[PDB]
């Protein structure tokens, strides 16, 4: 015993859930995976197409191509089921319909795009289902009751379309009234609709089985290889004997105008060929599948010909009774006509609020439902191929079989069971989609995702959409005006295909780009699956119509970008400003949930500009050299401290910030400026070094200017601060670039004709040292200079192996660089070796000076005339007392060189 | 006297310019706008189509639809010229070709995508032009020298393709050798090629004019309304009299097998109808335009029928001599066949290094060249409509006119001048595109934009592409293997259409989004024009082929994203990490060059978390309330100061940072964390308030916790620091949110059944105060509460504005104005007066005794509220009355459950 439904859950349920945040009523609607996602999805996938058009598709395509069609459609819907299950498992499943899940999983932009595309899909589905119910009623149930009787022969089709337009509009107004007043009854009879569907399918299978030994007696009159209609004929014989008199049969009256055979003038094909009674349903074992295993694709108005019977060759006798191909078929048309029979998988999660284990019921339920329907379709394709005559299949309105439903002829009790079950199922699906479309529309309106749809957010006392339904009815009316399933199906299929394409593309993107909160806890979801689904039914979209598909893509893209713009204006306050703001925030967030390190190290600079008492940059050269080092790309944060109290220096801070920005723009520096008004310059710099940049966009190198004239100034703060900053940089594990004699650094406009960047590679931190000159040489200023590595390791035997390691590394760099190893006494490099030993264990002053002068001797003797001498640095002393000695060591170590870039790694650089 | 060229300038010139950075040689190549951009673009737009296929297109389309085709193509190329001129004016024009301009203007990603699409365009153009030169030579000049003689009927049709494939491959190997050895000669003879083109067009016009009084004698044999070929027939008469004997003419031998008229068995149409000589070029005044003003679109193999002359009705006599439609035409096919006649506008700026005023010569020159060629095409459409028979036009191989070029029949001297000028022009354009494709390829390789193309960066001693040219030759070979202009034209057109679509879309985007360094100094460029061009010829792309267009779009998109990825990995060091890094940096940069303010104010929070001596968050409720306030969207920077020395507390700073990040994620706060290890807590907070966030992603509100138990603690620093922070926030012009009794603030899981957020709106700063409760109510926790505004006081004007804002907000709120004595609100009115005074230029016992009145009213009205917002008075000017200020605040909030003290201190709207 159970009282379930197959409809959706709109804003009413999501709202109840949110309020219920802070139960016995909830527990009772809890439904297992089977009755929660299997039956809703099964009742909503099994549409009208399976009946009114599957036999026709099989016939006009040949079992092979029909199998290919059903397989491609089922493949796009199965990969979309996998992507939708990945969405369902990821995070908490909201209580609303599939729209709320898709929204909370893919962001409001994709949520709204999918919502509107799926909504247009559902409206045109309510239109197709009303057209189908009308077509079944009118062609098969009550043919006599058509308001416009067919006029002559040429206007017979036109008279039918008007019957369908008027009857469909009346029926649509009826269905709208039903859904508006008494949707509870629709919920109650969803089970009866599913019952009708399943009874119909079991009747189809029972007929197919019975058709092996005893097939039914539905014969078709056929003149040679020309199939005849049986809507008016009684006997498939040229002369029907009446009262022992061989009077001509009615077909004679339809091919010869005499009607009395008194010297009757019969046309050519009638006199030459012969009328035969061909069994319309041969046995399943008869082996007709070999006959109908091939496409027909006859264009419009072509006579349907069974390529088995004999025939004469005369032509010209065009007649009304010849059953004709009613539409110029093709593969790309058949795929579109059949696709709305696999749609409805988003209905699997239309009952997600009343579930027990959502992430477990929704994926399994949906995939099992799609497997069931795919098996039913792929089995019925072959059964129709192997049970129905190759002529009764191409009959798209049950003609030539005495006016019975083509699939109806395959049934155990009678074709009547199917002709009524299809009608009830199709009107039920129309009601279902006229309840599912306006609920989704009011949910998209209530979310305030799109502003102008706010009007449709209005609900009834119970939370039913009063003003969304009217728009749904209007769109269904526009659809019904094209009173033909064969022409509504491509549009419906295109809208549902766009919905499925976005559901597959959002999952592929969010898996590749490592989108935050994208944890697809599924045992079989791989982004390649969703990508293959997106590709497959993108191809499907374009195949069916290349112009409708572009219109759908552009509509969805405009809705997506407009939702993004509205979200920007909502959260940041401005449209385009806020749009870039959201882009930056999202990039930084995505940047946070990732490995902290990088496979390669690239210097992101923090230029520490020193501001004089006039609040002017004391060293613009710093900015010029930073621009040359980064070459206008990358991150450059220009930081500076203004000594004083912030409470009264805000105006000065703003003025100096404008000054530094103008200077950066003048020196082609692309980056950002940050001023800190601090009580102590040293503490301000210690705060800039560790706090600049938003998380994930941190710097990793600190670029400083050398404290020129440290000895001259009586105050010891200037030299002591530089050391403090060096210690802060080393402790923070950031790289350090101390530029000395920066006033002589070349400007952005001038250039070097010829020169040598003499990188000095000393025991360690070789990665930063080697990487620097190439970044410099990549700029036009340092472009025309060479590079010389004066390695100072051991003597020569060690160097040969190292020479190979450096030469190959440089080979990977692919920039010319000659390395020379100069033997140096360990004592001369004692301070370095000491620091290295301290590092290895972790993982005097007179000697330092007397060795620094040896370093001076070698460095000047080799590199006196260099344009820029890079040089590795030793760490600062542990005791802050020897800071003067450390600065003297550095000053002597750099005595006599034109332009030095002291470099200290102090990090895991490679 | 001048020696100019129409070829491109690749990496060799761009490199010379860059080196020449730090002249007499440069000055000499300087060329004026006319000879620098008008003639190169004119010489490169006038291709082979104008001759070999324009007459055929006019005929098979009808003058009206042919006019529509030429107009649509010219419209896409003109809008693309406007966008490309906008690119040319914006910024300095690089010395290289058009590729370098497009690159430096649209970024390397679009630069490389457009470069490769335009490169495939140029290669398939070298293929089409070689095919055209071969077709002209073989069909019109020397038919005798064809290696595969046509045989039978079906074999004869495919006999030609083998002649064309072999001759085209031979010609392509010849052209490749020429360009490889002696491109200087091509530069020298570019002028002769342009001369041939212009002489040919003037010959067309002279023929059209002469066709007014005296049209030429090109007759066509026509059997009834069935056109015959005249390659073998001599007289358009059934019987050709020989030696005074009426012997049957050869056409009799081609329709009757007797050949002696001895009881000859002639077929049906031949016996019934008549052969007639129809003047093939009637006068311009003859008025045939009225006849050929309509489309034909006859499918493949259909006999071409003039619907004017008499005819019998018998059918069945299918014959070889009946001129047949050689391809199943359609409108969408004609647009594709014709589009490669308007391509070449990027060649206008292929000589930009040798210019005087680039930003002035390139736009005018390009637009004038396109106007000239568009007028020439639209004029020749009408001239062909009004001068050539409606049957001679649909002849795509000069049949029925004795085997002469269709357009050749319209010329003053003879069709030979055009048939040779077209051949030389088409081989010259082939040479041009076999020099322009590899130069562009080596420029894309040398830019190191795409890695794997590095092999093709290799150049010759003079800087000629040795290995790029070979790939161009291979692709041209693959093109020539499809030995038919009618099938190469759609591919060429698709590649050039993709190039133009990207050039229009990048400009539209960079104009809309306010991309940095996008200054389009043009007098007529509006982004709507580039957008209309993008749309027009996107439609053109898809019309011509919906599957080729998708393949091109996917190829270009993959190249674009791959270039972006390679640039990320190059500059940042990682692929996806660096990709997000570049996205963030670019967004922030774009965010910088814009108005600092915003039309709406939205609170971007900086939560100041206080870290205790255990390095644990002393107030997680701060984060919970920040999450509720921002609702998971927006910017939230959580800042905290660790008192101590940074040299030894780095590990502690990292540990506490991980702690704060875990807490943020636990409280559903989406944002970033920044720790500052400072010697003094007050200075650390004063530095966080002014330095957090990258430029453009700044905060505008500071969210603080109230210093609970300030009086109890003997140390006065705790209460004094809060005031210091308030002053820092006010001075920085940021909003301020002081939360009091924050330990009682509701958690993210619980909710309120019913309650009232009692926003108290006092004289000023009404914008922040009104905006807050609605952002709070937008969260599920505060969803089920009501709002009550207890207004106490241009305050009257402000109240009306607030009411209007409430109406705009559309969320139910009831406002009550309570009369209060000015003395009670004295501290507020005093501050307001100070504000008005400063704006115009551009005690304690009373404050406490009035604060208690404020307490009386506020508690009597709002004692049971769930959250009482309340405006704040400014801190005293003298830092001595700071205790008095804190006492004022403490009493002002005495008795309320949960208070959010709010201070605007900014231009909040
Ligand atoms: C159903 O019967 C009609 C009536 O004869 C068939 O029409 C004709 O069928 C032939 C196939 O034999 C078609 O092709 C012809 O083939 C012969 C083979 O030598 C060839 O000599 C002819 O020139 C022609 O190509 C023919 O086009 C078709 N129509 C006419 C007017 O003759 C029809 O094909 C039969 N159904 C099927 C499925 O074959
Ligand atoms: C060139 O001359 C031939 C020889 O008659 C034309 O063939 C026939 O042309 C007629 C049009 O005059 C076509 O349509 C017919 O129209 C009459 C009008 O009443 C109608 O009674 C017929 O049933 C038919 O629809 C006809 O299809 C066509 N072919 C045959 C076999 O008659 C040919 O059309 C002429 N060329 C042009 C461009 O018109
Ligand atoms: C063919 O020529 C004869 C005599 O010149 C003429 O009478 C007849 O009408 C012509 N046929 C047609 C179709 O004009
Ligand atoms: C059709 O079948 C009949 C048997 O009544 C036969 O006489 C007639 O010849 C058949 N058609 C043929 C062979 O033309």
Distance from CA of A690 to the nearest CA of B (A): 7
Structure tokens at A106: 């893919």
Residues in binding site of B: 289-290, 292-294, 449
DSSP label at A321? S
Mark yes or no for CB contact A672/B696 under 8 Å. Answer: yes
**For the residues of B397-430, what is the DSSP string, one character each?**
T-TTTTS--TGGGS-SS-HHHHHHHHHHHHHHHH
For A419, phi then psi, to 5°, come to -65, -25
Q: Are residues A705 and A763 in the same domain?
A: no
- Whether B319 is in a domain gets the answer no
Residue of A nearest to B512 (CA): A576
Domain boundary among A470, A501, A532: A501
Task: State the CB neighbour count (10 A cutoff) for residue B779.
Answer: 16
Chain B residues near residue A774 by CB distance under 8 angstroms: none
Q: What is the dihedral of CA A15, A18, A22, A26, to 10 degrees?
A: 70
Cα gap B777→B759, rounded to integer Å? 12
Residue A19 to residues A465, A639, B2, B746, B784: CA-CA distances in angstroms? Answer: 20, 49, 84, 16, 8
Shortest distance between the Cα of B483 and any Cα of chain A, in A, equals 28
Helix axes B650-666, B620-630, angle to 10 degrees: 50
A129's enclosing H/E stretch is helix A98-135
Residues A862 and A732 both lie in one domain: no
Using a CB-CB cut-off of 8 Å, the residues of chain B touching A546 are 542, 546
Q: Select from B310, B311, B312 the residue to mutate for testing ligand 3; criterion: most ligand atoms less than 8 Å from CB.
A: B310
Which among A387, A214, A379 has a CA at the least distance from the CA of A284? A387
Alpha-carbon distances, residue A30 vs A5, A98, B904 (angstroms): 12, 17, 50
Judge contact between A893 and A735, C-beta under 8 A: no
> Locate tokens 């790939």: which residue?
B471
Shortest distance between the Cα of A798 and any Cα of chain B, in A, equals: 31
The protein residue with its alpha carbon nearest to ligand 1, atom 17, reads A313
Two tokens at B754?
């019913």
User: What's the resolution in A?
Assistant: 3.3
Q: How many CB atoms lie within 10 A of CB B337?
A: 26
Helix A415-446 and helix A98-135, axial crossing angle in degrees, nearest 10? 140
Interface contact B513-A688, CB threshold 8 A: no
Q: Do A189 and A142 share a domain, yes or no?
A: yes
Let me know if residue A434 belongs to a domain. yes
**Measuring CA to CA, which residue among A410, A342, A422, A331 is closest to residue A374?**
A342
Considering only the beta carbons, identify the residue of B583, B598, B674 that sits closest to A573.
B598
CA distances from A448 to A21, A456, A563, A592 (A): 22, 11, 10, 30
Pocket residue to mutate for ligand 1, from A294, A305, A394, most atoms within 8 A of Cβ: A305
Q: Using an 8 Å Cβ cutoff, are A527 and A508 in contact?
A: yes
Residues A860 and A720 in one domain: no
Q: In whole angstroms, what is the distance from residue A413 CA to residue A203 CA?
A: 8
Same domain, yes or no, for A632 and A560? no
| B703 and B775 housed in the same domain | no
Q: How far is the CA of B321 from the centre of ligand 2 (A)?
A: 21
CB atoms near residue A457 (< 10 Å) = 18
Q: Which residues of A touch B783 (CB under 8 A)?
A: 18
Report the distance separating Cα A807 and Cα A813, nearest Å: 10
**Is the same domain home to A678 and A802?**
no
Nearest ligand to the CA of A273 is 4
Looking up tokens 């562009």, which residue turns up? B440
Residues with CB under 6 A from ligand 3: B 224, 273-274, 310-312
Q: Measure the CA–CA gap between A747 and A763, rounded to whole angstroms.
A: 32
Binding-site annotation: residue ranges of B for K(+): 289-290, 292
Q: Indicate the residue of B587, B646, B695 with minimum beta-carbon distance to A731.
A: B646
Ligand 2 centroid – CA A302 distance (Å): 22
Residue A269 corresponds to which tokens in the numbers above? 């094909």
Residue with tokens 């149930």: A141
Residues of B in contact with A684 (CB under 8 A): 687
* Ligand 4 center to A262 CA (angstroms): 22
**What whole-number distance in Å separates Cα of residue A793 and Cα of residue A763?**
7
Alpha carbon of B481 to ligand 3 centroid (Å): 48
State the residue range of the domain holding A351: 11-215+331-501
Give the DSSP letter string of A453-495: GGGGG-B-TTS-BHHHHHHHHHHHHHHHTS--HHHHHHHHHHH
Contact call for residues A53 and A380 (beta carbons, < 8 A)? no
Pairing label, strands B226-227, B219-223: antiparallel
CB B626 within 8 A of CB A615: no
- DSSP code of B354? T
* A767/A892 same-domain check: yes
Task: Report whether residue B305 contacts ligand 2, using a CB cutoff of 6 Å.
Answer: yes
Cβ B906 vs Cβ B734: under 8 Å = yes
Strand order in the sheet with B672-678: B672-678, B636-643, B605-608, B701-705, B735-740, B899-903, B868-871
Residue B661: count other Cβ atoms within 10 Å of its Cβ. Answer: 17
Q: Is the distance from the beta carbon of residue A311 to the nearest atom of ligand 1 less than 6 Å?
A: yes
Q: Which residue among B584, B677, B693 sits closest to A690, beta carbon to beta carbon?
A: B677
CB–CB of B521/B90 below 8 Å? yes
CA atoms of A330 and A24, how far apart (whole Å): 56
Closest residue (by CA) to atom 27 of ligand 1? A313
Q: What is the CATH number of the domain that holds B432?
A: 1.20.1740.10
Q: What is the DSSP string of A324-354?
A: B-SS---HHHHHHHHGGGT--GGGGGTT-TT
Q: Which of B565, B570, B635 to mutate: most A Cβ within 10 Å?
A: B635
Of A735, A513, A732, A718, which is closest to residue A606 (Cα–Cα)? A735
> Based on the domain organization, do B757 and B720 belong to the same domain?
no
- Largest Cα separation within chain A, whole Å, is 142
The CA angle A638-A639-A642, to the nearest 5 degrees, is: 140
Q: Specify the 3-state DSSP secondary structure of B470.
A: helix
The answer to whether residue A363 sits within a structural domain is yes
Detail the residues of B annotated as belonging to a binding site for chloride. Answer: 289-290, 293-294, 449
Q: Is A644 helix (H, G, I), strand (E, B) or coil?
A: coil
Q: How far apart are CA B425 and CA B350, in angstroms?
A: 19
Rounded CA gap, A854 and A824, in Å?
A: 9
Exposed (0-12), middle (13-18) or buried (19+): which is A148, by Cβ within 10 Å? middle
Q: Are residues B709 and B764 in the same domain?
A: no
In a mutational test of the pocket of ligand 3, which residue from B222, B224, B274, B307 has the highest number of ligand atoms less than 8 Å from its CB? B274
> Is residue A307 in contact with ligand 1, taking CB distance under 6 Å?
yes
Gyration radius (Cα) of chain A, Å? 41
Crossing angle of the two packed helices B882-892 and B844-862, in degrees rounded to 10:
20
For residue B763, is it within any domain?
yes
The total number of structural domains in chain B stands at 3
Query: In A631-739, which ranges are continuous DSSP H helix?
Result: 650-666, 681-691, 717-731
Distance A580 CA to ligand 3 centre (A): 79
CB contact under 8 A, A674 and B684: no
Chain-chain contact of A696 with B634 (C-beta, under 8 angstroms):
no
Which atom of ligand 2 is nearest to B314's Cα? 4
Q: Under a CB-based contact definition with an 8 Å cutoff, are residues B159 and B148 in contact?
A: yes
Residues present in chain B in total: 909
Question: Among the atoms of ligand 1, which is closest to the Cα of residue A315?
Answer: 31
Is there a contact between B409 and B280 (Cβ–Cβ < 8 Å)?
yes
SS3 B243: coil
The atom of ligand 1 lying closest to the CA of A311 is 2
Tell me the backbone φ, ψ of residue B758, rounded to 5 degrees: -90, 80
* Residue in B19, B573, B670 nearest the CB of A599: B573
Contacts of B654 in chain A (CB under 8 A): none
Question: Best of B606, B697, B699, B866 to disrupt the A interface by mutation (most A CBs within 10 Å)?
Answer: B697
- Does the C-beta of B315 come closer than 6 Å to ligand 2? yes
CB A62 within 8 A of CB A296: yes
Ordered DSSP codes for A709-732? TTTTSS-SHHHHHHHHHHHHHHHT
Inside any domain, residue A310 = no
> Phi, psi at residue B158, to the nearest 5°?
-90, -5
Alpha carbons B422 and B46: distance in angstroms, whole number: 10
Residues B729 and B789 in one domain: no
Count interface pairs A-B at CB distance under 8 A.
203
- Residue B401, judged by CB atoms within 10 A of its CB (0-12, 13-18, 19+), counts as buried
- In sign, the C-alpha dihedral spanning A882, A887, A892, A893 is positive
B244 found inside a domain: no
Q: Give the closest residue to A742 by CA, choosing from A582, A868, A842, A585.
A: A868
- Of B750, B785, B818, the one marking the end of a domain is B750
In a 3-state reduction of DSSP, which class is residue B900?
Answer: strand
CB-based contact B684 A686, cutoff 8 Å? no
Nearest 10 degrees: CA dihedral of B174, B176, B180, B185? 60
- Contact A816 CB / ligand 1 (< 6 Å): no
- The torsion defined by the Cα of A346, A347, A351 and A356, in degrees rounded to 10, comes to -60
Contact yes or no for A222/A391 (Cβ under 8 A): yes
Q: Do A605 and A558 belong to one domain? A: no
Q: Please count the CA atoms within 13 angstroms of the CA of B586 that sit on its side-chain side.
A: 19
Residue A279 lies in a domain: no
User: Are A683 and B679 an interchain contact pair (Cβ–Cβ within 8 Å)?
Assistant: yes
Q: Which of B534, B537, B581 to mutate to test the interface with A (most CBs of A within 10 A)?
A: B581
- Domain holding A702: CATH number? 3.40.50.620
Distance CA B829, CA B174 (A): 92
Residue B826 and residue B854 in contact, taking contact as beta carbons nearer than 8 Å:
no
Residues in a beta bridge with B247? B240
Residue with token string 């509504």: A488
Is A435 within the bounds of a domain?
yes
C-alpha closest to that of A787 among A769, A801, A773, A771: A773
Kindly report the protein residue whose alpha carbon is nearest to atom 15 of ligand 1: A313
Q: What is the DSSP letter of B136?
A: I
Query: Partners of A738 in the beta sheet?
Result: A704, A902
Long-range interactions of A528-531: CB distance < 8 A, separation 24+: A529/A79, A529/A82, A529/A83, A530/A79, A530/A82, A530/A83, A530/A86, A530/A504, A530/A505, A531/A504
Q: Which residues contact B197 (CB under 8 A, 6 or more apart)?
A: B42, B43, B46, B421, B425
Helical segments of B49-153, H only? 49-52, 54-89, 98-135
Ligand 1: does its nearest atom lie under 6 Å from the Cβ of A268? Answer: no
Return d(Cα B889, Cα A673) in angstroms, integer. Answer: 37
């Amino acid at each position: 015993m159970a009282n379930y439904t197959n409809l959706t859950q709109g804003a009413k349920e999501h709202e109840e859930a949110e309020n219920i945040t802070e139960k016995k009523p909830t527990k009772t609607p809890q439904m297992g995976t089977f009755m929660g996602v299997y039956l809703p999805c099964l009742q909503n996938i099994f549409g009208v197409i399976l009946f009114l058009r599957l036999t026709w598709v099989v016939g006009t395509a040949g079992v092979l191509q029909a199998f290919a069609i059903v397989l491609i459609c089922c493949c796009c819907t199965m990969l979309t089921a996998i992507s939708m299950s990945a969405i369902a498992t990821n995070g908490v499943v909201p209580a609303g319909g599939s729209y709320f899940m898709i929204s909370r999983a893919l962001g409001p932009e994709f949520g709204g795009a999918v919502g509107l595309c799926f909504y247009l899909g559902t409206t045109f589905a309510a239109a197709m289902y009303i057209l189908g119910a009308i077509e079944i009623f009118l062609v098969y149930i009550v043919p006599r009751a058509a308001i416009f009787h067919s006029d002559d022969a040429l206007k017979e089709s036109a008279a039918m379309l008007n019957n369908m337009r008027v009857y469909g509009t009346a029926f649509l107004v009826l269905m709208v009234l039903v859904v508006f007043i008494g949707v509870r009854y629709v919920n109650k009879f969803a089970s009866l609709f599913l019952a009708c569907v399943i009874v119909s399918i079991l009747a189809i299978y029972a007929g197919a089985i019975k058709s092996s030994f005893a097939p039914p007696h539905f014969p078709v009159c056929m003149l040679g290889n020309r199939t005849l209609s049986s809507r008016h004929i009684d006997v498939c014989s040229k002369t029907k004997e009446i009262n022992n008199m061989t009077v001509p049969s009615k077909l004679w009256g339809f091919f010869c105008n005499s009607s009395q055979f008194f010297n009757a003038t019969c046309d050519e094909y009638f006199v030459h060929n012969n009328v035969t009674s061909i069994q319309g349903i041969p046995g399943l074992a008869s082996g007709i599948i070999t006959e109908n295993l091939w496409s027909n694709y006859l264009p419009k108005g072509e006579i349907i010909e069974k390529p088995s019977a004999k025939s004469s060759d005369v032509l010209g006798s065009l007649n009304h009774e010849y059953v004709l191909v009613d539409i110029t078929t093709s593969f790309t048309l058949l795929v579109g006509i059949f696709f709305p029979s696999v749609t409805g998988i988003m209905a699997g999660s239309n009952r997600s609020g009343d579930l027990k284990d959502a992430q477990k019921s929704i994926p399994i339920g949906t995939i099992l439902a799609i497997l069931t329907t795919s098996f039913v379709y792929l089995s019925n394709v072959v059964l129709f191929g192997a049970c129905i005559e190759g002529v009764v299949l191409r009959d798209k309105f049950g003609d030539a079989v005495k006016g019975n439903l083509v699939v109806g002829t395959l049934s155990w009790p009678s074709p009547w069971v199917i002709v009524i079950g299809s009608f009830f199922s199709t009107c039920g699906a129309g009601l279902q989609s006229l309840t599912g479309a306006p609920r989704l529309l009011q949910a998209i309106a209530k979310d305030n995702i799109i502003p102008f749809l706010r009007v449709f957010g209005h609900s009834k006392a119970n939370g039913e959409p009063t003003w969304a339904l009217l728009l749904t009815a209007a769109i269904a009316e526009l659809g019904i005006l094209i009173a033909s399933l064969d022409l509504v199906a491509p549009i419906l299929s295109m809208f549902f295909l766009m919905c499925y394409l976005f559901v597959n593309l959002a999952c592929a993107l969010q898996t590749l780009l490592r989108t935050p909160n994208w944890r697809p806890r599924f045992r079989y979801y791989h982004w390649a699956l969703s990508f293959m689904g997106m590709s497959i039914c993108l191809a499907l979209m374009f195949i069916s119509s290349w112009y409708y598909a572009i219109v759908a893509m552009v509509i969805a893209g405009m809705i997506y970008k407009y939702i993004e713009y509205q979200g920007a204006e909502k959260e940041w306050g401005d449209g385009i400003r806020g749009l870039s703001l959201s882009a930056a925030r999202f990039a930084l967030l995505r940047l946070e949930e990732g490995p902290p390190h990088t496979k390669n190290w690239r210097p992101q600079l923090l230029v520490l500009l020193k501001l004089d008492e006039d609040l002017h940059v004391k060293h613009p050269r710093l900015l010029t050299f930073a621009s040359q080092l980064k070459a206008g790309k990358g991150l450059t944060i220009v930081g500076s401290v203004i000594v004083g109290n912030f409470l009264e220096n805000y105006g000065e801070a703003l003025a100096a910030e404008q000054t530094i920005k103008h200077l950066m723009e003048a020196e082609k520096v692309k980056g950002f400026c940050q001023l800190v008004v601090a009580a102590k310059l040293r503490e301000g710099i210690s705060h800039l070094i560790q706090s600049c940049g938003l998380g994930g966009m941190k710097h990793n190198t600190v670029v400083m200017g050398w404290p020129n004239g440290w000895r001259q100034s009586e105050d010891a703060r200037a030299w002591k601060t530089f050391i403090g900053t060096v210690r802060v940089t080393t402790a923070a594990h950031l790289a350090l670039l101390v530029a000395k004699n920066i006033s002589f650094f070349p400007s952005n406009v001038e250039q070097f004709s010829e020169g040598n960047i003499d990188v000095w590679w000393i025991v360690h931190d070789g990665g930063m040292l080697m990487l620097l000159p190439f970044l410099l040489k990549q700029h036009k200023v340092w472009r025309k200079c060479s590079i010389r590595i004066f390695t100072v390791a051991q003597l020569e035997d060690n160097s040969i192996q190292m020479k190979k390691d450096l030469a190959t590394f440089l080979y990977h760099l692919r920039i010319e660089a000659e390395v020379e190893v100069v033997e140096m006494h360990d004592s001369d490099i004692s301070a370095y070796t000491y620091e290295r030993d301290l590092m290895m264990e972790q993982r005097s002053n007179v000697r330092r000076m007397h060795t620094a002068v040896k370093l001076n001797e070698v460095i000047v003797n080799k590199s006196h005339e260099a344009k820029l001498v890079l040089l590795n640095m030793p760490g600062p002393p542990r005791n802050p007392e020897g800071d003067e000695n450390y600065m003297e060591f550095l000053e002597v170590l750099t005595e006599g060189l034109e332009r030095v870039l002291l470099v200290r790694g102090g990090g895991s650089e490679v």
